[PDB]
RNA sequence: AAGCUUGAGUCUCGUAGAGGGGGGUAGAAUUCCAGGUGUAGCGGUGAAAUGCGUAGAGAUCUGGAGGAAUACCGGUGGCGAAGGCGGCCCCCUGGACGAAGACUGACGCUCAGGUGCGAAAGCGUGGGGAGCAAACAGGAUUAGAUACCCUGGUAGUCCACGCCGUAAACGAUGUCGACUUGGAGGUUGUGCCCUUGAGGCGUGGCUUCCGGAGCUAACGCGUUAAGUCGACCGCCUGGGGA
């Protein structure tokens, strides 16, 4: 699975004591951490596709959550895209 | 998965009679209460009770005397693909006059005779025998 | 892959390319080279003695250590190359403190490999351990029959030879021809299998290349006049008569071994 | 750190190869703070069937508790010897002493 | 005791033909028979058993 | 345009898997090859022949090479969206399930046209080649035998990077949820108990053989329904001809 070095260490930037997992804004940063974890599973074991089928769901969950946050509040959407790498 | 809470109310009326239950329980709503209100007043159920402060459950009370059912037909009529509307004099007769129809109106849920008393038409939301 | 050229012309529509980033394609080290000079398939008196050989351009001799010995002095592959006088690859080896030499490369694509000289060495490809000291079933790479002749068989691209048995002063070994033979177990061998195996993968698809590939086009004995080849024809598409050599002999299916010296070591011939 | 037995056979007529690896192994595992619970020698033991006419083990086990990238030094050093058979790491199932 | 890697314990769960015994004599209370039948096959690769008695 | 917490989402920490894919490790025999060794049989069958052998078969003994697939375990026992998945060992890795908390607040279902998975056999390109085996090559049988059956055997089976997209893909059962009297047998979390119990009583997730209400032309389905009440997408209208 995704390492605890991505699911506990996120409370260094999106908090200071405890996590806020239903916030939409944390789920976009979590799905980016899944993408960075499963891109580590590339170029090796190349006839196994379940992580790539899972990534095809993660990339669209990430886009939908970003759009839904912009519809909820443009200020909380702006607050998110300034703390993401964005556009490669 | 689950779209129609009134189809999911009419199930309860059949399921409980098939098990000879003195009372039957379901997820509660302001509309399912507005229908239970009529089911008591038209003499089909003896009472209704809602219990729960954040997740209310609706309990409907039945009475038997012969070991048999008390409502042998109940139908949802208007459904999401085909709702049926009727005007104040074209209001429908059920089972050649041996049943009654329920109307949503522009005010709230009542029978076809209470609608024809006020002068109202509207959506025909249930038949009961 | 093995990548194929896009169709644009004859013969390039058939051409394939294969690459090795660790192969050195540049000119050889000059202190290990002799001129050779082509004989043109012609003898000392200047007359033809072998047909369709020795044309084109300059083709030198690499000084190869086919009699390589030493003990306790390992060597490293400094460079990996090819040579147009043969089909397999050549490795330039540098010994522990000095001196550059050549050896015939085992299977694999890279340089930097370390190989041992000695009898007490490990069972690793390229080591000089005699056929007396191998576990049997091993592959012997380039094989030696006499120490004053050196590594004399299994030298071509993709070649291999397995040992069958050890008995008396000898080992019994297989061959790519089906030849079954015994050889003295004190001979050094070279250990492993021969590399390259791509010398046939050439396409070219142009008939002008004969000269730069060291040869010239042959003319048919049935197409030339009956004075210069005993086929004589005919007339084209009118072969008429049974096949023979340009020298009047029946050889298709007719055997020509008669040395009287070596069948004493060879139990079964070509199959 | 993950639990591992680190167990290897070695033929008793070849037992001179064991101090030629285990004295380097124990210093590598103490450099990784590994517990080395057992470090036990079983005298001489038989195999379940003879293999290339060798049927006997010197049989030693360490039980290390050690990192995945430290047992890689053991894996590659048993593979470097090759004449040693059934060099196994036998993961997990917690630590063992006296084995009941 | 209590583990399959000891031959004086292991020999009580197998036959003189190399086969595995019925649950009625394994002491697994019919609830660990599946896992014990795999632990016995794992003992072949631990050099405790041959892979078949006929070889 | 603002709310609600049941279905749904996600996390530190755990639970069981032949789900997916590597790198090590392993046994035997059909075969190819060199000795040990004994004598004319072996092989097939209703009988024989082709074939294997007499230049020493098959049997039996040693040494070596070659490669698919993993016997038993193994099943009404797990896992996957299906196809299917299987020696062991150590890895890489999606999903699912759990307990206490927390954070969301309808995020729930299906889907025109799109966009994507292969059992086996086949192809595109080169390797690898022990069984086996279309074709090929012979024998037998029969009046005949371009077949059955027997004796040899090429493609292929295997590995990489792509194509093929089809099957009893069958449990002949399209897909989401809720509701429901029973018997008998398993698989795996979790809570409380001297587990003073061959565990027990609760609580979660799965799974198999029977059986009653229900369904139905009758067979078949039966709480994992072909039942019951609802939401959605495709196709059919006698067959031949197609």
From Swiss-Prot, chain A:
SMART domains: Ribosomal_S15
Pfam families reported for this sequence: Ribosomal_S15
Induction of the gene: Part of the metY operon that extends to pnp, also has its own promoter.
GO molecular function, one term: small ribosomal subunit rRNA binding
Entry-linked InterPro entries: Ribosomal_uS15 (IPR000589), Ribosomal_uS15_bac-type (IPR005290), uS15_NS1_RNA-bd_sf (IPR009068)
Gene Ontology CC: one annotated term: cytosol
GO biological process: cytoplasmic translation; regulation of translation; ribosomal small subunit assembly; translation
Keyword set, alphabetical order: Ribonucleoprotein, Ribosomal protein, RNA-binding, rRNA-binding, Translation regulation
Keyword rRNA-binding: yes
Function: One of the primary rRNA binding proteins, it binds directly to 16S rRNA where it helps nucleate assembly of the platform of the 30S subunit by binding and bridging several RNA helices of the 16S rRNA. Binds to its own mRNA, stabilizing it 5-UTR and preventing its translation.
Family: Belongs to the universal ribosomal protein uS15 family.
Subunit structure: Part of the 30S ribosomal subunit. Forms a bridge to the 50S subunit in the 70S ribosome, contacting the 23S rRNA.
HAMAP family registered for this protein in UniProt: Ribosomal_uS15_B
Protein name as catalogued: Small ribosomal subunit protein uS15
Originating species: Escherichia coli (strain K12)
Taxon lineage: Bacteria, Pseudomonadati, Pseudomonadota, Gammaproteobacteria, Enterobacterales
Swiss-Prot record, chain B:
GO biological process, one term: ribosomal small subunit assembly
Alphabetized InterPro entries for the sequence: Ribosomal_uS8, Ribosomal_uS8_CS, Ribosomal_uS8_sf
Repressor keyword on record: yes
GO MF entry, a single one: rRNA binding
Keyword Cell wall biogenesis/degradation: no
GO cellular component, as recorded: cytoplasm; cytosol; cytosolic small ribosomal subunit
Top-level taxon of the source organism: Bacteria
Alphabetically ordered keywords of this record: Repressor, Ribonucleoprotein, Ribosomal protein, RNA-binding, rRNA-binding, Translation regulation
SUPFAM superfamilies given in the database record: Ribosomal protein S8
Function: One of the primary rRNA binding proteins, it binds directly to 16S rRNA central domain where it helps coordinate assembly of the platform of the 30S subunit. Protein S8 is a translational repressor protein, it controls the translation of the spc operon by binding to its mRNA.
PANTHER family: 40S RIBOSOMAL PROTEIN S15A
Family according to the record: Belongs to the universal ribosomal protein uS8 family.
UniProt xrefs under NCBIfam families: PRK00136.1
Subunit record text: Part of the 30S ribosomal subunit. Contacts proteins S5 and S12.
Protein name: Small ribosomal subunit protein uS8
Species per Swiss-Prot/TrEMBL record: Escherichia coli (strain K12)
Curated annotation (Swiss-Prot), chain C:
Keywords, comma-separated and alphabetical: Acetylation, Ribonucleoprotein, Ribosomal protein, RNA-binding, rRNA-binding
Modified residues (N6-acetyllysine): 241
InterPro entries per record: NA-bd_OB-fold (IPR012340), Rib_uL2_dom2 (IPR014722), Ribosomal_uL2 (IPR002171), Ribosomal_uL2_bac/org-type (IPR005880), Ribosomal_uL2_C (IPR022669), Ribosomal_uL2_CS (IPR022671), Ribosomal_uL2_dom3 (IPR014726), Ribosomal_uL2_RNA-bd_dom (IPR022666)
GO biological process: cytoplasmic translation; negative regulation of DNA-templated DNA replication initiation; ribosomal large subunit assembly
Keyword Ion transport: no
CC annotations in GO: cytoplasm; cytosol; cytosolic large ribosomal subunit; DnaA-L2 complex
Any Pfam family hit: Ribosomal_L2_C
Biased composition (Low complexity): 38-47
Taxonomy, superkingdom: Bacteria
Region (Disordered): 27-52, 220-271
Keyword Acyltransferase (UniProt): no
Example GO molecular function: transferase activity
Record SMART domains: Ribosomal_L2, Ribosomal_L2_C
Misc note: This protein can be partially replaced in vivo by its H.marismortui (HmaL2) or human (L8, from the 60S cytoplasmic ribosome) homolog.
PANTHER family: LARGE RIBOSOMAL SUBUNIT PROTEIN UL2M, RIBOSOMAL PROTEIN L2
Family named by the database record: Belongs to the universal ribosomal protein uL2 family.
Subunit structure: Part of the 50S ribosomal subunit. Forms a bridge to the 30S subunit in the 70S ribosome, contacting the 16S rRNA. Interacts weakly with S6 in one of the 3.5 A resolved structures. In pull-down experiments interacts with CedA.
Protein name: Large ribosomal subunit protein uL2
Species assigned in the record: Escherichia coli (strain K12)
Taxonomic lineage: Bacteria, Pseudomonadati, Pseudomonadota, Gammaproteobacteria, Enterobacterales
Gene: rplB
Curated annotation (Swiss-Prot), chain E:
GO MF terms held by the record: mRNA 5'-UTR binding; small ribosomal subunit rRNA binding; structural constituent of ribosome
Domain of life: Bacteria
Keyword rRNA-binding among record annotations: yes
Keywords: Acetylation, Ribonucleoprotein, Ribosomal protein, RNA-binding, rRNA-binding
GO cellular component assignments: cytoplasm; cytosol; cytosolic small ribosomal subunit
Single Gene Ontology BP annotation: cytoplasmic translation
Protein name listed in UniProt: Small ribosomal subunit protein bS18
């Amino acid at each position: 699975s995704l390492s605890t070095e991505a699911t506990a260490k996120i409370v260094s930037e999106f908090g200071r004591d405890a996590n806020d997992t239903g916030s939409t804004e944390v789920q976009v940063a979590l799905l980016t951490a899944q993408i960075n974890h499963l891109q580590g599973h590339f170029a090796e074991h190349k006839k196994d596709h379940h992580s790539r089928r899972g990534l095809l769901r993660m990339v669209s969950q990430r886009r939908k959550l970003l759009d839904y946050l912009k519809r909820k509040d443009v200020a909380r959407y702006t607050q998110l895209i300034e703390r993401l790498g964005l556009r490669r | 998965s689950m779209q129609d809470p009134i189809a999911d109310m009419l199930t309860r009326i059949r399921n409980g009679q098939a098990a000879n239950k003195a009372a039957v329980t379901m997820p509660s709503s302001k509309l399912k209460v507005a229908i239970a209100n009529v089911l008591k007043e038209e003499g089909f159920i003896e009472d209704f009770k809602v219990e729960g402060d954040t997740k209310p459950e609706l309990e409907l009370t039945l009475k038997y005397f012969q070991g048999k059912a008390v409502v042998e037909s109940i139908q949802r009529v208007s459904r999401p693909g085909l709702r049926i509307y009727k005007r104040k004099d074209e209001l429908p007769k059920v089972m050649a006059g041996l049943g009654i129809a329920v109307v949503s109106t522009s005010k709230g849920v009542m029978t076809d005779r209470a609608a024809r008393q006020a002068g109202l038409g509207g959506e025909i939301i249930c038949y009961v025998a | 892959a093995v990548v194929k050229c896009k169709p644009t012309s004859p013969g390039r529509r058939h051409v394939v390319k294969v690459v090795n980033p660790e192969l050195h394609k540049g000119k050889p080290f000059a202190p290990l080279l002799e001129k050779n000079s082509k004989s043109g398939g012609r003898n000392n008196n200047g007359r033809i003695t072998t047909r369709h050989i020795g044309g084109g351009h300059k083709q030198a001799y690499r000084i190869v250590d086919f009699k390589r010995n030493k003990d306790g002095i390992p060597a490293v592959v400094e460079r990996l190359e090819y040579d147009p006088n043969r089909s397999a690859n050549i490795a330039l080896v540098l010994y522990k403190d000095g001196e550059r030499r050549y050896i015939l490369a085992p299977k694999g694509l890279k340089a930097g490999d370390q190989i041992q000289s000695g009898v007490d060495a490990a069972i690793k490809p390229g080591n000089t351990l005699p056929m007396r000291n191998i576990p049997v079933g091993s592959t012997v790479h380039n094989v030696e029959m006499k120490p004053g002749k050196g590594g004399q068989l299994a030298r071509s691209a993709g070649t291999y030879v397995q040992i069958v048995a050890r008995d008396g002063a000898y080992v019994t070994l297989r061959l790519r021809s089906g030849e079954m033979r015994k050889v003295e177990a004190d001979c050094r061998a070279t250990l492993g299998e021969v590399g390259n195996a791509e010398h046939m993968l050439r396409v070219l698809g142009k008939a002008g290349a004969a000269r730069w590939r060291g040869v010239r086009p042959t003319v048919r004995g049935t197409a030339m006049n009956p004075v210069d080849h005993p086929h004589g024809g005919g007339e084209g598409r009118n072969f008429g008569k049974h096949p023979v050599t340009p020298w009047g002999v029946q050889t298709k299916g007719k055997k020509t071994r008669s040395n009287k010296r070596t069948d004493k070591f060879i139990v079964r011939r070509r199959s | 750190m993950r639990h591992y037995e680190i167990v290897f056979m070695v033929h008793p007529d070849q037992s001179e190869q064991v101090p030629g690896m285990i004295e380097r192994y124990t210093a590598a595992i103490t450099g990784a703070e590994g517990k080395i619970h057992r470090l036990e020698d079983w005298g001489r033991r038989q195999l379940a069937y003879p293999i290339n006419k060798l049927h006997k083990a010197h049989y030693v086990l360490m039980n290390v508790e050690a990192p995945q990238e430290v047992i890689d030094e053991l894996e590659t050093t048993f593979r470097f010897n090759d004449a040693v058979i059934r060099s196994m790491v036998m993961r997990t199932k917690h630590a063992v002493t006296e084995a009941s | 005791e209590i583990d399959y890697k000891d031959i004086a314990t292991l020999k009580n769960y197998i036959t003189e033909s190399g086969k595995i015994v019925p649950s009625r004599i394994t002491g697994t209370r019919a609830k660990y028979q599946r896992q014990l039948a795999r632990a016995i096959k794992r003992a072949r690769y631990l050099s405790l058993l041959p892979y078949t008695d006929r070889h």
